[PDB]
Design a protein around this nucleic acid. Structure first.
Length: 185
RNA sequence: GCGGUAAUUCCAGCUCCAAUAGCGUAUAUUAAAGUUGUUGCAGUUAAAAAGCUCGUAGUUGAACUUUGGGCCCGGUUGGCCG
């Protein structure tokens, strides 16, 4: 049973469909299976897109992100292909530890890898996964609101030019901040 | 500052001003005085930047690390519709 095997937890129908897709990809087999057998995800989050589609957020343990990062292209192509009406993307379950206060207090202090801002920055880096961000800008709007511009490279934006709003909605839903992307020319 | 022959200031007389049963004088002090400066001084030339540099105390010193209630308010994007 490489179905509930490859997550590493029982639920649920979405993740199981995904796992059986993984399995059907593994059955390719040779080059795909070779690096797709160790790569397991943990959970999935299906959420809205401003258009019609939904968006798959595939959560990961983050020692697997390397092999996941080697592929991403073929998993996003095949999963978007099979599970249509969707925008697929993988992400890493990064633990956020709370900020030390006088009430709450923790030994094994709190490295900056585990802080919130870093985790949020990395989430963006994985949403894009390709296309090394050229810049970030943050407008602070007079209505006390905040928006982040993320400046992308023109290379390989064709692969994700149809996912921007989904990424925006995702980051807004998880992190709570508004978002926009941009490519200089 | 007045005053050396016809003194608007001296000495008297007259007239008048202020304060008033209190007034003046002298000294010390106070704000005035941002003329001792934390607020708040100054330093080309008016008094004052060490001949210049290092340097201990001293003074000072880049940026960075997630939030419980509820109500109202209005923005700014998003869709859903145009």
């Amino acid at each position: 049973a490489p179905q509930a095997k490859i997550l590493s937890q029982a639920p649920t129908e979405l993740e199981l469909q995904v796992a059986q897709a993984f399995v059907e990809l593994e059955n390719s087999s040779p080059e795909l299976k070779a690096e797709l057998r160790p790569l397991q995800f943990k959970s999935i989050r299906e959420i809205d897109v401003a258009g019609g589609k939904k968006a798959l957020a595939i959560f990961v343990p983050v020692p697997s992100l390397a092999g996941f990062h080697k592929v991403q292209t073929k998993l996003t192509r095949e999963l978007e292909k099979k599970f249509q009406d969707r925008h697929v993307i993988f992400l890493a379950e990064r633990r956020i530890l709370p900020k030390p206060s006088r009430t709450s207090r923790q030994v094994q202090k709190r490295p900056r890898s585990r802080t919130l801002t870093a985790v949020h920055d990395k989430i963006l880096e994985d949403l894009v996964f390709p296309t090394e961000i050229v810049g970030k800008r943050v407008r602070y709007l007079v209505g006390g609101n905040k928006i982040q511009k993320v400046l992308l490279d023109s290379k390989d934006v064709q692969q994700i030019d149809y996912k921007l709003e989904s990424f925006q909605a995702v980051y807004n839903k998880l992190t709570g901040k508004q978002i926009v992307f941009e490519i200089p020319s």
